[PDB]
Amino acid sequence: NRIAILKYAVPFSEELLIWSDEAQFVLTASGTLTSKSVELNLTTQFDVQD
Amino acid sequence: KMDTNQIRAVEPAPLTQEVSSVEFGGSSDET
């Protein structure tokens, strides 16, 4: 609901953190990534900057 | 895993092809 551009992404292992100014995301798949099971969740709301 | 679960429930059918053939009778000749 808020058009947030994506600036920083840090891959660990099974999750990819997406960081945009007011909203942060986790990209986790389970098993293979494989598009159908790609998933995203809005975890935190803290502020990052350019 | 909503996308993976639902796509597994799609299950389209293969429907292999099937064809038949023509027939001719012939005639019997008199005189």
From Swiss-Prot, chain A:
Location(s), subcellular: Virion
Function of the protein: Structural component of the short non-contractile tail. The tail complex is involved in viral genome delivery. Forms the end of the tail, including the canonical tube, the nozzle, and the small extensions below the fibers. Once the tail tubular structure is formed, the interface between gp11 and gp12 generates the proper environment to interact with the six gp17 trimers.
Subunit architecture: Interacts with head-to-tail connector protein gp8, the tail component gp11, and the fiber protein gp17.
Name of the molecule in the record: Tail tubular protein gp12
UniProtKB/Swiss-Prot annotation, chain B:
Protein name as annotated: Protein 6.7
Protein task: Plays a role in virion morphogenesis, and is ejected from the infecting particle into the bacterial cell.
Location of the protein in the cell: Virion
First-to-last residue of the parent protein present: 11 to 41 of 88
